[PDB]
Write a structure and sequence with these properties.
Length: about 25
């Protein structure tokens, strides 16, 4: 179930990409 794989990365990226692409 890859979907789980992304959930782990998406969460890591989400927080990281959230602070890098700050508008």
């Amino acid at each position: 179930l890859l979907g789980d794989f992304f959930r782990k990365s998406k969460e890591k990226i989400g927080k990281e990409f959230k602070r890098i692409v700050q508008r």
